[PDB]
Design a binder for this molecule. Structure first.
Ligand SMILES: CCCCCCCCCCCC(=O)O
Ligand SMILES: CCCCCCCCCCCC(=O)O
Lengths: 214, 17, 285, 254, 285, 214, 254, 17
């Protein structure tokens, strides 16, 4: 198409740090999942923190989420937001968990990905039959569960669909949250999501996560 | 690729990087 | 050889994705599953490190998530409205014979939110115009429009047949009923090396000084008139301006807008309503 | 001798002394999924001899009144040994099949079965309106379904029993476009179909989707004079071939 | 050499047919006329085996029975209807200013029956749009239409001038009176490697779970509006969507539909009528 | 024409068994002819079966049909259905007959193709002057009659036309349906049709064999 | 860092940040049976990733009063996914194991567990006379057995609860002659044992014979001052390794 | 054969097989 400014020379392109060439570079950055998302927490930083504490009963559940990247609570993460500009997704997801207790606190967690066809696991015993990590909390404060791409079709819809749904993450006490004296008997964990090396988005669309009136 | 107009800006979408 | 890049471009296979390598059980002091997110780096762990994978030849491509693909689609950026008059005096006036629009990407949320994923952007702009002239009487008459780009500091029209419409130096494009949608390119036109999507700065030191991206580059005004003099039957004219970025560069990615826009060139988010506060798309459970 | 067959699959062996060759559906032998066509990145389990073996389904009686029978795959094998367990413990599976249909009689019986394997045999309802066939009805397991003439029930989720319309709005005379054999009682006592995995995805949920339907329809009714055995069994034996499963999880419960 | 394939393509001689060889009387233990259809194989016998044939140089070609020839013709797949209003409130509403249509090949029997000769199909789709705006008053006004493809999960328009029509990421095509028929390609867009014409499966394990090809891939929605605001004289607008498959592959041939279609994505065939049962085209004698 | 999805990469084409490249591959497959097609049989599998039984009189007729591929009863066969998407046809047809009596039953049949210009044969003596097969029923239960392409013009219309009509198949007792004791004195035959190697269809059209109301 | 471990088995991964190395029992890594040592001639099924993965058993609470715990293998896994199904559907099986025992605490807790794998841990009765330990008692499944001081019951089929006599008439101080580690709460939060298949026959009935017993005994009691967590879990995760099965049959039912 | 558009899908009918 013809230029409206027929001899115009644009201003020199200077080097600027942080050039982005592809949105998957942004999906490959961890962003916090608002896992807690109760009515008391969604106006606050508290939605990003999952509570851990010394249990009286063994093998209790800590949290659960659907893994489908543009479903709630993943939807407002950077990967969920970018995925909601696209109709299809594929490839593996990395969920990372950062323990924020004291250095004197100890914990093991079983974090499990359960594929479609059985709903959410009702116990750690059901959950551990799926893909899982036993995470020992230590000097390294962060662990990652990879949700491998395990699907019938090469792609899934980003919009919720019972044919295309990706399954669930569940987190369980392996052992317990154990502390000595003079240590809080409770702590927070922060949950994060990012794309693995195989992750892709396909058919561009208007997002369902932003609207305009007037 | 043929360019019909005298300005670089007039060309279609750039090659991917 | 350039023919390989052409074949990859027509197949949309330019941006290849790694294969999944086969992996086996591992028992090691190496623990790829463990890291320190405190470092600000995202863990490098991949599926082969944490499950036993098969070999998969990965067919996926990233071409459609390129910034050229993502921002390089035509979206509406303005609706410019005027209602013509049969009265010779009223047909000369703004809002009746002609209308002006201060150029920005700020008024339409779908485009605005996408470009605001970046702090700085540089692109040439393809403009396409969709005119719809709603006949209010028994006939359309002869509809000829002039769209004139008025750069910053050039005189803006005050009347439908003002001297400024002579367009002796400004770019004008003419459209008539049945003509295909007007299209032209605006080259990247900032006085800076990129457009500021955001600007944490001011035009001055004072309480009254402007703040934000409005300071950084005035983008001029689109002026549209009906060229036709007053006619028997009125028309409610709406010109929709569509913008496609081309030759795109983008820098410093940002969190997406999480709450409704309130004003142009402003990150302000608090609504006027006293019962309803600012709303996010995080659903409770 | 072209009349004979022996098929050995794991610890199971089938024989027939009156075959009419065997059909390899679409001319493609079953095989494991290759890395070029795969999408699920987990290493699949290949249970081999414990899974890829003949399971004999519940036998049915062919009478002068019979209208036909059908089974769905993998559904007919969901309770069958290690193949059945692997379907319930994994999100994904893929398999081919050997189907051997058995129906002996005398030199004095008459009758013709068509034995067809239909890919994506999406059934019609037995009722008017847009109501689709219910899950429990298309998942009868190793019993399969017996077709009954003029069957009366109130359940609008039940499938068509019109074998002359292939249970799906298409004519029975065109059923031979699918992988098929006949059992013509004067010629042969068995039919053998070798089925590759056929789907638009490289693996699929075994419990949500039946890739193949085995349809057995008497075209020429069973006839035999007094003193001859008046009804004869039809017995179906099916072996998975190159069965694979991936995405292990807790066992599905209905 | 590619020029030979070009010459054969312009002559429609790509798919040559065997010559009839001359044959003579035969007296043999070989009996080509006899076989066992029980095998499931069709007899290989040819005319030369059963009559004394002459030599015939066979001029016939099979090019027009190729799947590209058979499915690669434009047929109607939707009629999208809306009736514009002079009332500013009513012109904003669905069925009046705009209409939506859930994409499928299921609504028009001529196309549906042809593609349903196969179990799986893979093709790119050429879409062509034929708009006919029936003038209900003394003038057409200015007719400008926007067709927007809304992929699954993108927000569907609820109003004629809703924010969704900005089309910042969706594909839109604009049409105005006197413009040639709009045309664009949709590439093969399933999440699977082929479209399911039939699917013997469910979206779930339950009594309420959906059955059949509707489960397999949601195809999104075409939304059409008149872009023009309310006008004096109403129009009964019908947009006909024509579809041609291209680059076609098809698998697992099926018996053709022998009885009327009743519903979309369903093999159901029993009509609502209590006197009239389902009708075939087999004539009695 | 321009793509509406300008960087979209389609899902990988996987190998699927049973690819069809040409409709003549489908016409080359035998499908059953509803030869019986009386009002009592057209709602049933019985329309596909022709009755055979011990005759008292010699040389009786078994059945007749027109051979024109898109005429009744051939019209609803797969070759007749595919032919009805086309205006012209040419080449030879294979009619196959499978005897479904007992192994203890014996029969000879004369199956004849009669060209245009004389109507349907009124006797086996008239029929045997045309192209015919004497079929002996034995260990091979199936026989095929080829209807050779014998036409003035290179093609025929698929729609019935007195200038373009293809003639008739008739089937006759050669000898009789003979049985020992304890054997049914009657049996069924199944009739099938498919295309020979020379068969073609030309000018594509809307089918007359399917309609839509509403 | 020698403190760290990650073990990946199928779709399961375990981590620890305070190990004390790992023990390969008798210095032999697990492997499949070779043709030289095999006797059963049927091709074995090798279910690979769906079977050779960590299963986490039911967790137990270590208190200042605890006397010990034990599990039997393969019995502890008989209900565990595809490994458990394969044990019930086959006459013969063989497997090695990775056992990972998990017990975190603070820098302020004290305690010592010995964690031992005993081959052929033939138990003594808790009663006088020649009455042997009952099948149901040596087959507790994934729960294992908790040892109780001075336990009172009338059942003469119950096993010894004398952890100081190894439940079998041999002294606890000599238990280190078996493949073992310790969990000393000041040093480590886990123990790892890699167990080859150990038997006098190349494969065996999985349900009739427990090749290994996992024994966990507190030698130094759990001690921790007020305000510290007074009881800490012990969690056992076990992965089959190189699991093989042969002689497929109908499912065993108890 | 000249292809005017940047996508393989934009081309006309494929060659016969
Ligand atoms: C004169 C035709 C319209 C030109 C549109 C220019 C769009 C880029 C403006 C960037 C600054 C902004 O508004 O945020
Ligand atoms: C968005 C423009 C219309 C696109 C038409 C797609 C046609 C193929 C759909 C295949 C599935 C079916 O409906 O059976």
């Amino acid at each position: 198409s013809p230029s409206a400014f027929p001899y115009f020379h644009p201003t020199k392109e200077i080097f600027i740090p942080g050039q982005v060439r592809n949105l998957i570079e942004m999906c490959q950055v961890d962003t916090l999942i608002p896992v807690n998302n109760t009515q008391e927490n969604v106006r606050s930083v508290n939605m990003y923190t999952v509570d851990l504490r010394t249990q009286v009963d063994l093998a209790k559940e800590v949290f659960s989420i659907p893994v489908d990247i543009a479903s709630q609570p993943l939807a407002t993460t950077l990967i969920g937001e970018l995925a909601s500009y696209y109709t299809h997704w594929t490839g593996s997801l990395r969920f990372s968990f950062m323990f924020c207790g004291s250095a004197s606190s100890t914990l093991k967690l079983l974090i499990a990905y359960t594929p479609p066809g059985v709903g959410k696991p009702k116990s750690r015993r059901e959950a551990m039959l799926g893909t899982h990590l036993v995470w020992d909390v230590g000097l390294q404060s962060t662990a990652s569960l990879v949700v491998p791409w395990v699907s019938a079709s090469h792609f899934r819809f980003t919009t919720p669909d019972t044919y295309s749904s990706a399954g669930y993450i569940t987190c369980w006490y392996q052992t317990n949250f154990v502390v000595p004296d003079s240590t809080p008997d409770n702590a927070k964990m922060v949950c994060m999501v990012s794309a693995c090396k195989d992750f892709c988005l396909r058919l561009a669309r208007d997002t369902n996560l932003h609207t305009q009136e007037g | 690729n043929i360019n019909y107009f005298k300005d670089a800006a007039s060309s279609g979408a750039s090659r991917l990087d | 050889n350039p023919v390989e890049n052409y074949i990859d471009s027509v197949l949309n296979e330019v941006l290849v994705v790694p294969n999944i390598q086969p992996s086996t059980s591992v028992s090691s002091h190496a623990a790829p599953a463990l890291d320190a997110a405190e470092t600000g780096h995202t863990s490098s762990v991949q599926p082969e490190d944490m499950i036993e994978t098969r070999y998969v030849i990965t067919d996926q491509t990233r071409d459609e998530t390129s910034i050229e693909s993502f921002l390089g689609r035509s979206g509406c950026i303005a609706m410019i409205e005027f209602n013509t008059s049969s009265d010779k005096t009223e047909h000369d006036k703004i809002g009746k014979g002609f209308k002006t629009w201060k150029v920005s990407l700020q008024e339409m949320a779908q485009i605005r939110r996408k470009y605001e994923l970046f702090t700085y952007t540089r692109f040439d702009s393809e403009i396409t115009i969709v005119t719809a002239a709603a006949a209010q009487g028994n006939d359309s008459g002869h509809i000829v429009l002039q769209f004139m780009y008025v750069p910053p500091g050039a005189p803006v029209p005050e009347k439908r047949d003002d001297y400024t419409w002579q367009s002796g130096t400004n770019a004008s494009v003419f459209w008539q009923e049945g003509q295909p949608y007007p299209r032209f390119t605006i080259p990247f036109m900032s006085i800076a090396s990129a457009y500021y999507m955001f600007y944490d700065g001011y035009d001055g030191d004072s309480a009254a000084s402007k703040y934000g991206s409005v300071v950084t580059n005035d983008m001029g005004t689109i002026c549209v008139r009906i060229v036709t003099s007053n006619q028997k039957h009125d028309s409610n004219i709406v010109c929709r301006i569509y913008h496609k970025a081309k030759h795109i560069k983008a820098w410093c990615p940002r969190p997406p807008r999480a709450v409704a826009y309130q004003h142009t060139h402003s990150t302000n988010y608090i609504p006027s309503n006293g019962e309803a506060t600012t709303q996010i798309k995080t659903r409770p459970d | 001798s072209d009349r004979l067959i022996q098929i050995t699959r794991g610890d199971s062996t089938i024989t027939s002394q009156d075959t009419a060759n065997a059909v390899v559906a679409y001319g493609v032998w079953p095989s494991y999924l290759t890395p070029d066509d795969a999408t699920a990145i987990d290493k699949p389990t290949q249970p081999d001899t414990s899974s890829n073996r003949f399971y004999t389904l519940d036998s049915r009686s062919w009478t002068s009144a019979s209208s036909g029978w059908w089974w769905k795959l993998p559904d007919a094998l969901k309770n069958m040994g290690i193949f059945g367990e692997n379907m319930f413990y994994h999100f994904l599976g893929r398999s081919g099949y050997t189907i051997h249909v058995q129906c002996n009689s005398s030199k004095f019986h008459q009758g013709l079965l068509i034995v067809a394997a239909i890919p994506e045999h999406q059934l019609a309802s037995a009722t008017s309106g847009n109501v689709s066939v219910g899950y429990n009805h298309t998942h009868p397991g190793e019993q399969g379904r017996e077709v009954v003439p003029s069957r009366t029930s109130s359940d609008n989720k039940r499938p068509s029993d019109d074998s002359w319309l292939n249970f799906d709005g298409t004519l029975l005379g065109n059923l031979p476009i699918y992988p098929h054999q006949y059992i013509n009682l004067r010629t042969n006592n068995s039919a053998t179909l070798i089925l590759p995995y056929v789907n638009a995805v490289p693996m699929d949920s075994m419990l949500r989707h039946n890739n193949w339907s085995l349809v057995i329809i008497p075209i020429c009714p069973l006839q035999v004079q007094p003193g001859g055995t008046q009804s004869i069994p039809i017995t179906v034996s099916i072996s998975p071939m190159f069965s694979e499963f991936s995405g292990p999880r807790s066992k599905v419960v209905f």
